[PDB]
Amino acid sequence: MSSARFDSSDRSAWYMGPVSRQEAQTRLQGQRHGMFLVRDSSTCPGDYVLSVSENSRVSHYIINSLPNRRFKIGDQEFDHLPALLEFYKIHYLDTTTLIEPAPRYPSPPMGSVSAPNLPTAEDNLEYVRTLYDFPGNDAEDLPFKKGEILVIIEKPEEQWWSARNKDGRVGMIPVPYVEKLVRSSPHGKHGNRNSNSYGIPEPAHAYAQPQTTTPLPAVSGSPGAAITPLPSTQNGPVFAKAIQKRVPCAYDKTALALEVGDIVKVTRMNINGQWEGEVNGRKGLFPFTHVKIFDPQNPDENE
Numbered sequence: 001m002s003s004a005r006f007d008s009s010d011r012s013a014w015y016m017g018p019v020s021r022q023e024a025q026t027r028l029q030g031q032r033h034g035m036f037l038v039r040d041s042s043t044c045p046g047d048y049v050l051s052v053s054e055n056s057r058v059s060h061y062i063i064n065s066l067p068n069r070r071f072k073i074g075d076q077e078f079d080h081l082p083a084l085l086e087f088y089k090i091h092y093l094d095t096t097t098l099i100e101p102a103p104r105y106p107s108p109p110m111g112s113v114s115a116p117n118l119p120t121a122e123d124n125l126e127y128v129r130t131l132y133d134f135p136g137n138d139a140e141d142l143p144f145k146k147g148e149i150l151v152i153i154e155k156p157e158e159q160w161w162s163a164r165n166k167d168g169r170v171g172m173i174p175v176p177y178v179e180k181l182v183r184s185s186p187h188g189k190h191g192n193r194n195s196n197s198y199g200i201p202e203p204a205h206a207y208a209q210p211q212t213t214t215p216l217p218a219v220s221g222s223p224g225a226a227i228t229p230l231p232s233t234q235n236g237p238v239f240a241k242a243i244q245k246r247v248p249c250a251y252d253k254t255a256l257a258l259e260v261g262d263i264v265k266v267t268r269m270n271i272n273g274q275w276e277g278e279v280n281g282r283k284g285l286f287p288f289t290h291v292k293i294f295d296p297q298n299p300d301e302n303e
Helices: 021-027 081-087
Strands: 015-017 035-040 048-053 059-066 070-073 076-078 127-130 148-154 160-164 170-174 238-242 262-268 274-278 283-287 291-294
Touching: 021 035, 021 048, 048 081, 059 148, 070 081, 076 081, 127 160, 148 170
Parallel strands: 015 035
Antiparallel strands: 035 048, 048 059, 059 070, 070 076, 127 148, 148 160, 160 170, 238 262, 238 291, 262 274, 274 283
């Protein structure tokens, strides 16, 4: 299952525009984690600032307006904004990937307000220096020296921390190698503790198929959102084919279960992702289910 999905194109989905340090931080103060927003750079006019929520600890990634009409996020340059968002779908920024953007109207009740990167306290994990120098020279492994200052821009693991070098380059670095400045000490609960090492236990992927380099030509263009009341079209209900296996969940009470080769009868499709459809003796909501919208009634695209 994919955790990272969103759109990676919709300016009205992830672009938060007028926000700024205070607004950005409080809109991503924990929230649900794995949520991000690209606002207008309150630091430098013309640039942007991708703030990402993890550990109640919104890591701020600055995106530059390159004159060749490209974007450069913290030493790492890509071809465009939605391209870095796509790369971080498998990168894991802080300790998670870019699941989905934060709603542009993320009105919260209370409790989590502002809190400038608070995974524990105002001490540990943010400014660390390294003394042992491990110059791997990668974005996977930070080349740190024998007395540089690092910023733990990401802390996915307990034994490895992803800090930006004296250069500002993001890479993973060993804890027994470091030197954190204004910090108390390992107090157990005082150390954030994402978890005592993660682990996905599914023996079905003991020898899993690699992700594989395969750039697929996905049909792009312009936001297809017809707000028009739909004129003389004589269209009826919407039919979708379940092209991927879709079982329910432990917290499922309205999640439709579908599978490959089944035709989902959906009359009500909500713009929140979960459509209302009645299929095999059971009707409920489905997150598109992993289906594809088509028309099995006409001969034009009968195949």
